[PDB]
Amino acid sequence: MVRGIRGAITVEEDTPEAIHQATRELLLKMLEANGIQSYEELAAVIFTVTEDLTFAFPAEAARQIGMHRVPLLSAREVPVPGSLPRVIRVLALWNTDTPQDRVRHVYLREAVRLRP
Amino acid sequence: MVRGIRGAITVEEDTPEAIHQATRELLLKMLEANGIQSYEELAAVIFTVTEDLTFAFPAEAARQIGMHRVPLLSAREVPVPGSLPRVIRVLALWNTDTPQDRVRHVYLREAVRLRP
Amino acid sequence: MVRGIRGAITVEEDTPEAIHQATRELLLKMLEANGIQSYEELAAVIFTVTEDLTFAFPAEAARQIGMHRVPLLSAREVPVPGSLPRVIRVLALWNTDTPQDRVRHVYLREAVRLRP
């Protein structure tokens, strides 16, 4: 059984450093919020990056925390004009029997505005 | 076990309203075609939107029908010149033991041209 | 249980033919490297294409080798300036109990530079 976990975080500036730190923070909190003990529980992780972020290497953030063996993919987030700027989103596919209503989705910084 | 479900639908005009209605129609038919009784069966849902659609909020369509707890992600569809215009595509990851050849994929409106 | 499989391959020229052949080669090797006997084992396959590739139809390559019933999705890879050019990436979601450290990820041609 698989459960997707969503995450989102914003960065104040378009720099690789800011993007790296933000991605790392989000990944760690998504793991913490769901009590995930090992990366072996993750089937894969998909990232989306908004068009206002340039040198975005979210994969390197995952690598720094040891997710070397977790398959990662990064795609351009649909560029809706006027949408929340500078956002890194995550969709982690988690092998778990955790009920859908018990999965914890994480929205940080300005990304909290994304959820009602 | 997980089975992906594909869906595709076109819109006649580039407006949030047209995109919303089309997305909703597609999602409902994909669920209906596969006899899905609860959203809890969905691991996650990924959407792709073509570059000729601007204010596309497919996630709001999913929310309107109650998919609040289903993790969603939306990415830009590879923009191949001359390809079918104004398409909203869906890839639903379904937790099921349904045989691959028994999963029903849904193509609506002009999107029927996508499949041979 | 699901395990993602990553693949990446580069093409020397931006033509549909070059993209088709490369995609096919990558898909076949990813299957071969993991001893996959049937496509029925694949939940879905997601492709990302870099912005320097134009008429990219990776789905047709999958179709040619018989993956008609495997749900496919293709999105634009985040366009980081100066990143490795002309890359077709794959993320295959595999229903298997294979340990995460035993899954074989495939990087071909210039894509070998992507992994340390």
Explain what this protein looks like in three dimensions.
- It is classed as isomerase.
- The structure is a homotrimer of 116-residue chains.
- The first copy, chain A, has a five-stranded mixed sheet with strand order 3-2-4-1-5, with helices on one face.
- The first copy, chain A, has a single domain (1-116), classed as 60s Ribosomal Protein L30, Chain: A.
- Chain A is α/β, with parallel strands linked by helices.
- The longest helix of chain A has 18 residues, at 16-33.
- Chain A has helices at residues 16-33, 58-64; strands spanning 2-10, 42-49, 72-76, 87-95, 106-107.
- Chains in contact: A-B, A-C, B-C.
- The A-C interface holds A 2, 39-40, 42-44, 46-47, 49, 54-57, 69-76, 93, 95 and C 1-6, 46, 48, 75-81, 89, 91, 93, 99-101, 103, 105.
Helix and strand arrangement:
Three copies of one chain form a homotrimer.
Chain A: E1 2-10, H1 16-33, E2 42-49, H2 58-64, E3 72-76, E4 87-95, E5 106-107
Parallel strand pairs in A: 1-5, 2-3
Antiparallel strand pairs in A: 1-4, 2-4
Jot down its keywords.
about 120 residues; alpha/beta; isomerase (chains A, B, C); aromatic amino acid biosynthesis (chains A, B, C); globular; homotrimer; 60s Ribosomal Protein L30, Chain: A; about 20% helix
